[PDB]
Each structure stands twice: as C-alpha cells, then as structure tokens.
Amino acid sequence: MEINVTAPALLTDEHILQPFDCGNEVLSNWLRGRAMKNQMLNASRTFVICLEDTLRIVGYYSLATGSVTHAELPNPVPVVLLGRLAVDVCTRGHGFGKWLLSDAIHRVVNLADQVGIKAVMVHAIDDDARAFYERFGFVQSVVAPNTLFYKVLEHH
Amino acid sequence: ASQRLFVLDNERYDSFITQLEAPVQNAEGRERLMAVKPEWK
Numbered sequence: 001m002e003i004n005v006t007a008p009a010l011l012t013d014e015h016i017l018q019p020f021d022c023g024n025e026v027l028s029n030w031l032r033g034r035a036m037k038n039q040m041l042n043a044s045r046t047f048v049i050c051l052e053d054t055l056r057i058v059g060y061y062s063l064a065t066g067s068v069t070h071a072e073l074p075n076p077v078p079v080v081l082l083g084r085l086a087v088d089v090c091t092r093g094h095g096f097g098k099w100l101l102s103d104a105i106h107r108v109v110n111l112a113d114q115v116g117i118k119a120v121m122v123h124a125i126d127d128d129a130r131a132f133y134e135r136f137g138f139v140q141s142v143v144a145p146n147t148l149f150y151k152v153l154e155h156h
Numbered sequence: 157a158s159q160r161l162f163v164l165d166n167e168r169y170d171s172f173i174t175q176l177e178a179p180v181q182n183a184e185g186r187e188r189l190m191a192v193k194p195e196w197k
C-alpha cells in the first residue's frame with residue numbers, strides 16, 4: 001500500500017508511542033520509556049515520523065553529542081551519536097529507513113557549521129544494522145567492535 | 157545505558173585519530189546517502 005509519512009519532527013507529549021514496533025524490544029522500549037525523559041533533560045533530541053494526518057509514530061531517530069578521549073586528562077574529539085534509528089515493522093520497504101538516515105545526517109552536517117563536530121557515530125547491534133549503515137557511507141571504527149562512523153567534512 | 161564518553165588507550169586513540177583524519181572512506185555508500193531524496197508530507 002502507498003504509505004505517506006510526515007517530515008521528521010521533535011517528539012512531543014502529543015505523539016502516540018504505544019503502537020510502535022520495530023521488531024527489537026530495546027528500541028521500542030527506549031522510545032516509550034526514555035525518549036521523552038531525555039528530551040526534557042536536554043540529554044538527547046529524538047525526531048519522529050508519523051503516518052500522514054496522525055500522531056502515530058512509524059519511525060524515529062535520536063541524536064546526542066559525544067566525546068572520544070584518551071587515557072590521560074582537541075582533548076576529547078567531538079562527535080554526534082546517532083544512538084537509535086528504527087522504522088515500524090508495518091512500514092518496512094518504503095524507503096523510510098534511508099529517508100530517516102538522510103535527514104539525520106543532513107541535520108548533523110548543518111549542525112557542524114554551528115559547532116565543531118568531527119563525525120557521526122552509530123552502534124550496529126546486529127549484522128543487518130551494520131549492512132544498512134555501511135550501505136550508506138559508514139565505516140568500521142577502532143573505538144568499539146559495533147561502532148561505525150561517518151566523517152563530517154569541512155563546511156561545504 | 158547509551159555510552160557518550162569513549163576513553164581509549166593511547167595506541168587505539170592514535171589509530172582513531174589517523175582513521176578520523178584520513179581521506180573519506182566508503183565514498184560509494186556516501187554518494188548513495190547523498191542521493192536519497194525523501195518525500196515527506
């Protein structure tokens with residue numbers, strides 16, 4: 001079926017979260033249990049997509065700043081952690097996954113004109129995750145066996 | 157959970173810097189991402 005979705009928007013209290021199911025309980029539970037808390041603590045920014053003309057979320061991703069430093073006291077290199085990205089089981093195969101990822105990376109690139117950001121880092125929990133991320137430009141990192149990175153270049 | 161601060165040993169940190177500062181890798185997948193044109197409503 002032709003499924004239409006709204007542009008990625010910050011998660012609010014009016015969005016409907018219970019229906020969401022991506023086939024991975026830690027990602028669905030994070031959306032319901034931790035996303036809005038992190039949003040109100042300014043710990044993270046969670047962006048969601050919804051079925052057109054509803055607040056029914058069918059996709060989301062989360063962004064947070066992070067740092068890579070060494071054993072002793074740019075002292076930490078600044079990164080952005082794309083910590084979660086998930087599309088609803090019922091809406092797979094429509095390109096929403098690569099759309100979300102394109103939006104997230106474009107958001108980070110414009111972001112990196114405001115502050116220094118050296119890369120986007122993701123954690124691929126599974127091999128299909130890895131295959132998706134690697135299909136769209138991510139690279140194995142030396143910081144963790146599951147951690148990949150997408151280099152941010154100089155301003156344009 | 158969700159780890160935000162990564163502390164590496166000095167040998168791994170240096171590899172990280174080298175791979176971070178190398179020319180971009182996976183340019184193929186990277187042109188793919190830039191080619192994605194979403195149709196948001």
Ligand SMILES: CC(=O)SCCNC(=O)CCNC(=O)[C@H](O)C(C)(C)COP(=O)(O)OP(=O)(O)OC[C@H]1O[C@@H](n2cnc3c(N)ncnc32)[C@H](O)[C@@H]1OP(=O)(O)O
Binds near residue numbers: 131132
């Ligand atoms: C940080 C993390 O969350 S890492 C784990 C990431 N998320 C998950 O694992 C959640 C479980 N899966 C999902 O949420 C979804 O499958 C996603 C986000 C991986 C894909 O969204 P989908 O709609 O399945 O994919 P979409 O339809 O956008 O596919 C875009 C392209 O990717 C390809 N593709 C999709 N899934 C995968 C995969 N796992 N491995 C390799 N290629 C893939 C598709 O063939 C398609 O090809 P195309 O460029 O020729 O059009």
